[PDB]
Amino acid sequence: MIVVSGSQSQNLAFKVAKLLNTKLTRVEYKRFPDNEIYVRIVDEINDDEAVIINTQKNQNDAIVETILLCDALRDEGVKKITLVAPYLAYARQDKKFNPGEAISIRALAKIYSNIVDKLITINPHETHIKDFFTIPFIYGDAVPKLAEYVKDKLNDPIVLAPDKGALEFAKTASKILNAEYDYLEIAPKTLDAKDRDVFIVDDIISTGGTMATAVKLLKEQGAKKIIAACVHPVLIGDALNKLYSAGVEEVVGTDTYLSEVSKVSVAEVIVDLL
Amino acid sequence: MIVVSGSQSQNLAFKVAKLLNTKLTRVEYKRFPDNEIYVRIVDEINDDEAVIINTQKNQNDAIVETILLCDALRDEGVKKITLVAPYLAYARQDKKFNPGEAISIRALAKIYSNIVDKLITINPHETHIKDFFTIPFIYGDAVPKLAEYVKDKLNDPIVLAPDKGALEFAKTASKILNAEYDYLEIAPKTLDAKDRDVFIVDDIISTGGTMATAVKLLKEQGAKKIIAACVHPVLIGDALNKLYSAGVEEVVGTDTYLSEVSKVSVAEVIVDLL
Amino acid sequence: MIVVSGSQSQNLAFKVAKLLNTKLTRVEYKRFPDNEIYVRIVDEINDDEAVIINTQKNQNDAIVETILLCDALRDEGVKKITLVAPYLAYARQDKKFNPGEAISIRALAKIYSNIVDKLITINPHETHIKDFFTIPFIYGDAVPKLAEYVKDKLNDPIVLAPDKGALEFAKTASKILNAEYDYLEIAPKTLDAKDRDVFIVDDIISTGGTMATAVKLLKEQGAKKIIAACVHPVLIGDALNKLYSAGVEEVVGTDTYLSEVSKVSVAEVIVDLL
Amino acid sequence: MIVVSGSQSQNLAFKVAKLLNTKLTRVEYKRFPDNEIYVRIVDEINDDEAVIINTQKNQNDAIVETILLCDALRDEGVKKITLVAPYLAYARQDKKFNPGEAISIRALAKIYSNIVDKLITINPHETHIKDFFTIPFIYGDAVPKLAEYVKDKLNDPIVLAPDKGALEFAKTASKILNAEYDYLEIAPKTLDAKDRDVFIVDDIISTGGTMATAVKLLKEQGAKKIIAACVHPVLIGDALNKLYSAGVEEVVGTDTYLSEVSKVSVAEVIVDLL
C-alpha cells in the first residue's frame, strides 16, 4: 500500500508511511495562476492499493483536491483507494434544522462512496453520519493519546466534559488517568473542583466560549491546574487568548487540524485502522 | 421553473429570472465561523424544476456550494435540476499532459452527471469535454454579444484571433460586423493592420501576455483604434494595466466572470438555452 | 502628472488617465510564493508628480501596496504624490465605542500624512475623519452620477434615504431628478409611497438589511418600481439576492468597489478633484 | 511589562508571558463582515510598557493589526511599546534589483520607527536591514535551539549549510553539536558525507528546492540519517513532501512561522532579548 500525501497532511502522511515502513510517494501539488489545484503522482505506481491522507482544514480545497487525486490514481491502475481525512469537514450535522436546508454530509457521502472504497476519520462529531455512506466508514479515537499526554502533568485530576454531549471523551480519558469524571450541566453535575487539578476534554474547540466559560467557573470553584484538550483544535480567531485569559494552564490538540497547539499526533491511531 | 441563485451569480440569476418573468427564489448564503458554506432555500418550493445559476470564479467554492444546493433542492421535491455555470472551472484541458496527472473535468463531469440533469456553460475552451458527461451538456456562445458591443465604436475594423485556436470567435464576430477576419500565426496570417481599426477577440484573457503581445505588434504595424474582447475576463494580477499600456483602446468582457470590465451580459444567451 | 495604477483600480486608473489625456504608466504587480506583494514602476519616470489610484476593497493589501508604491516613486524622483482611494477602508468610525479600542482611521491618517502629499476619496461615511490628517484631504461626491443613471428609468420618483443619516444623498439626487425627497424614520417621515416609483440612495450597502427592510415595507405601502443605488456596493454575501427578493427593480453601484453591479464610473468625479 | 497578544502569535505570547511570570493581557480580535480587522485591549492597562508579540506569516494582516494595536495602546497611556515579530515579512532584500522597484523593508521601517520604540525579530535573512530603522532593531538567534533538538537524534553528524550564505548557521549549530561543518558550493566544499549522519540547517525553507536538492545529492554520496532544520518553516505548497521524498529523516522548524513541523519554541530566545 503506497501512501499518497494530500497537500494538507504532508507531515501526518509522512509519519504514517514511516510507521507502515512504506516509501512515501512523491505527489506534486501547486496552483495555476487561476488558483486552480494541480496535482500529480510523480513516482511510478506499481502497487494497486493507495491511501490518501488529506485532512480538511481548508474544506472545499480538500474536497476538490481529493476528487482530482482519485481520478489520477484510478487512471494509473490503482484498484483500491482508502481516504484518510483526519478532520472531516461538513460532517457536523445529522439532519436539517430548517426547511430548505441541505444535509451537507449526505451530499458529500454520495461523492465519497463513488470515488473511494473506504473512508477513515478521527473523532467525528456525529457518529451517525456513517448511515449516509455506502462504503466502509471507519472512525478512530484520539482521546486516549490526549489523556496520555497530560497524565504526565496533572496531579490527581478530575476529567470534565464541557457538556453532557462530550461525556464519553471524559470517560475514555478518565479510564487512562485512573481519575473520576463528570460533565458541566452551570457546574459539574456531581463532582466538585475545589482544590483540584482539572482535565477538560472535548472533540472540538472552535470559538472557545463553551471552554473559556467552563474554565472561568472552575477557577472560581477553586480549581487548581487546568488543562484543556481537544482532538480538532480549530481555535478560530482569538480563541486561544480567550482560554489563556480564563486561566488555563495549557491547551493541547492533535495534528488532524493545524493549530499553534497541535502537539499530539494521530499517526499511530490511523495506522491501526489501516 | 424557479431560478436558484448561486452566491457567485446573484446579478446574472436575477437578470435571467426577469427575462423568464419568474419570481426569483430567496436563497440564504453565509459562512460559519469555520468558513464552511451554509446554503438555504428560503422561499417555499412548489414547482419541481429548478435552474441553478452559479459561475465558478472561485472554483472549489462553486463546486461545493453547487453540491450542497442540489442536495437541498432534491430534499425538497425538485425532480429536475439544470445547472448553469457561465464560467466552468477545471475544464480547460481534454487530457493528460504528463503521466500521473488527472483529467479534472473528467472527475467533475462524473459528479455533475450524478447531481444535475442538465449542464449549461458559456464558451467552453474545449468543446470535447462534453464526452465525459452522461447528461446533456449544452454550451452557448457570447461572442455575438461582444461583437454587437463594439460595432458601435470601431471604424471598418479587422477582426483578429490572438492565435489560430480562436479563429472561430473572430469569424463569428466577423460576420456580425461585416468585416474581414484573420489570426496571428508573429503577425496576421493574411491581412495587414496598417491604418486600420482592430477587434481582437478570444474566449479568455488570463495573464494578458498573448493579448498584450498582439497589441504591441499591431500598434507597430500601424493599427489604429484597438479593442480587445473576451468572454471570460479572468484578467489576473496586472493583466489590465499590461493591455492598456500596450495601447488598447478598451478591454471588454462578459458577466460570466466578475472583472472591472464585465460590461456585456450573457443573460439572454442563457435564456435561449433554457 | 503620470497616473500610477494600483492593482485594485486598474480600469479606473485607465479611464482617468484617458480623461487627463495622459500616457498610462506600466506598473508591474505580482505576488511572491510567500504571497508578499511585489510592485514595480516599469516605464521610466521623468515627471515628478504622480497620482496613485488604488481603491481598498481588499483593505490591508491596498494599504501595504500603497506604502510600497510610494517608496518606489520617491526613490525615483517623484516630488509630489497624490493618493486616490475611491473606497477608503478603516474610515467608517470617528472615535472609540469602547475603552481599549483604537481609532483606525486616526492611526492610518498618520501614515498617509507621511507617505503622500494629498489624499482623495469618494463619498466618505464620516466627513470628520479629515481632522486626523495633516495633509489635504479631498472628497468627491458620486451621488449626482447615480441620480443621472436612474432619471432615465424612473417615473416621477420619490427619492428616499434609508435613514436620517443619508438624507443629504437623497437631497442631492433629489435636486438632479427634480423630485421630492424624505427618509425612513419605520416609514418615511413625511412622504407616502403609495403608487409611486422610488429611488433609494445611500453611500453604502454591506449586509443589505437596512435596504431589504426599506424595500419590503415600501412595497407594502404600494410602491411601484424601486431602484436602490449606493456609491460603495460592498454587497456582502447574499446581499444582492436579499434585495432582489424584497422586490427591487434594480441595484446599482459605482466602480469605487468592485461588485456585480458597479455600473457607474467615478472617473470624471476624480478628474475634477485633480 | 504587559504582554499583548497579536492574533498570529497567541501561543508564543502566552509562553513568553509565562516565562516573564506576567499576567497575559486579554486582547479581543475579530473581523467585521467587511473582513476588516477589529482589535481591543480588554483588560485594564495600568503599566505603561507593553510588548506586542505578533509574527507575520500573513504579512499584510500582521502589519495592519500591529498598527491598530499600537494606536489602541497609546490611547490608553502606554509610554513604551516593543514589537516582537518572530518572523518579519518584507525584509528579505537589502536593495533594488531593478529600477522602478521599492525597498519594502525601507518603507516599513519608517512606519515601525514611528509606531514602536523597539523592534525584535528572530534570525532575519539580511542583518543590514537595521540600517533603515531609527529605533533599536534587535535580532535573536534560534539556531542554537534547533541544534539542541537534534543532538539527541543524530550520530556524530556533519552540519551542512545549503549554500555559502548560511555558513554561519552551520557553524553555530556545529559548535553546540561538537561536529564538523561545511557548505554546498554542487557538493560540500570540503567534507564528505559518505556513511555519515547529516544536519542541514538554514534560516528559511520556502519552496524546498535548495533543500530537496542537497538531500538527494547527499543521499547519493552515501549520507545516512539526514535531518533538515530551519528557523522559519515557510514550507510552501508541497515543500514537505518534496523533502521527505528526497529522503530526509525529519524536517523541523520553530514557532516563528506556523507549520506542520514547528516543534521548537523561540519563547526563551525572545525572553532574553527583553
Coordinates of C-alpha atoms in Angstrom, one line a residue, chain C residues 31-42 57 59-61 63-64 67-69 71-72 75-76 87-91 93 96 98-104 106-108 110-111 114-115 206-207 234 236 257, chain D residues 31-42 57 59-61 63-64 67-69 71-72 75-76 87-91 93 96 98-104 106-108 110-111 114-115 206-207 234 236 257:
Chain C
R31 CA 2.9 38.0 -5.6
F32 CA 5.9 36.1 -4.4
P33 CA 5.4 32.4 -3.5
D34 CA 5.2 34.0 0.1
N35 CA 2.2 35.9 -1.2
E36 CA 4.1 39.1 -0.4
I37 CA 3.3 42.0 -2.7
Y38 CA 5.8 42.9 -5.4
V39 CA 5.4 46.3 -7.2
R40 CA 7.4 47.9 -9.9
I41 CA 7.2 51.1 -11.9
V42 CA 8.2 49.7 -15.3
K57 CA -11.8 46.6 -1.3
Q59 CA -8.2 46.6 2.8
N60 CA -4.8 45.5 4.2
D61 CA -3.5 44.7 0.8
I63 CA -2.6 49.8 2.4
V64 CA 0.7 47.8 2.1
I67 CA 3.1 52.1 1.1
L68 CA 5.4 50.2 -1.3
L69 CA 4.4 52.2 -4.3
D71 CA 8.6 54.3 -1.6
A72 CA 9.2 53.2 -5.2
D75 CA 13.2 56.6 -4.9
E76 CA 12.7 57.6 -8.4
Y87 CA -13.2 53.5 -1.4
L88 CA -11.2 54.2 1.7
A89 CA -11.1 51.4 4.3
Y90 CA -11.0 51.6 8.1
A91 CA -12.6 55.1 7.9
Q93 CA -15.8 55.5 12.6
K96 CA -14.0 54.7 20.1
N98 CA -15.5 51.1 23.9
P99 CA -12.4 51.6 26.1
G100 CA -9.3 49.7 24.8
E101 CA -10.3 50.2 21.2
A102 CA -8.3 52.0 18.5
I103 CA -9.4 54.7 16.1
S104 CA -8.3 53.0 12.9
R106 CA -6.6 58.0 13.1
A107 CA -3.7 55.5 13.0
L108 CA -3.7 55.3 9.2
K110 CA -0.7 59.4 10.4
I111 CA 0.8 57.0 7.9
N114 CA 3.7 60.9 5.9
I115 CA 3.8 59.0 2.6
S206 CA -23.0 46.0 3.0
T207 CA -25.3 43.4 4.6
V234 CA -19.8 46.3 -0.8
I236 CA -21.5 41.1 1.3
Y257 CA -15.7 49.0 -5.0
Chain D
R31 CA -13.2 40.5 11.6
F32 CA -16.1 42.7 10.6
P33 CA -18.3 41.4 7.8
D34 CA -16.0 43.6 5.7
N35 CA -13.2 41.4 6.8
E36 CA -11.6 44.5 8.3
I37 CA -9.6 43.8 11.5
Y38 CA -11.0 44.7 14.9
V39 CA -8.7 44.7 17.9
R40 CA -9.4 45.6 21.5
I41 CA -7.4 45.5 24.7
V42 CA -10.0 44.1 27.1
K57 CA 3.0 34.7 8.4
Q59 CA 2.1 39.6 6.1
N60 CA -0.2 42.5 5.3
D61 CA -2.7 41.4 8.1
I63 CA 1.2 44.9 9.6
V64 CA -2.2 46.5 9.8
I67 CA -0.6 49.5 13.5
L68 CA -4.1 49.3 15.1
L69 CA -2.8 47.8 18.3
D71 CA -2.9 53.2 18.4
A72 CA -5.0 51.3 20.9
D75 CA -4.6 55.9 23.5
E76 CA -4.5 54.1 26.8
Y87 CA 9.1 36.2 11.6
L88 CA 9.4 39.7 10.0
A89 CA 7.9 40.0 6.5
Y90 CA 9.1 42.1 3.5
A91 CA 12.6 42.1 5.0
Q93 CA 16.0 42.2 0.5
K96 CA 16.6 47.2 -5.5
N98 CA 15.7 46.6 -10.9
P99 CA 14.9 50.2 -11.5
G100 CA 11.3 51.2 -10.6
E101 CA 11.3 48.8 -7.6
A102 CA 10.8 49.6 -4.0
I103 CA 12.8 48.6 -1.0
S104 CA 9.9 47.2 1.1
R106 CA 12.9 50.5 4.0
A107 CA 9.3 51.7 3.6
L108 CA 8.1 49.6 6.5
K110 CA 9.8 54.1 8.6
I111 CA 6.4 53.1 9.9
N114 CA 7.1 55.8 14.2
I115 CA 4.7 53.4 16.0
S206 CA 10.2 28.1 1.3
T207 CA 10.0 26.2 -1.9
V234 CA 7.5 28.7 5.4
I236 CA 5.1 26.5 0.7
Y257 CA 6.0 30.7 11.5

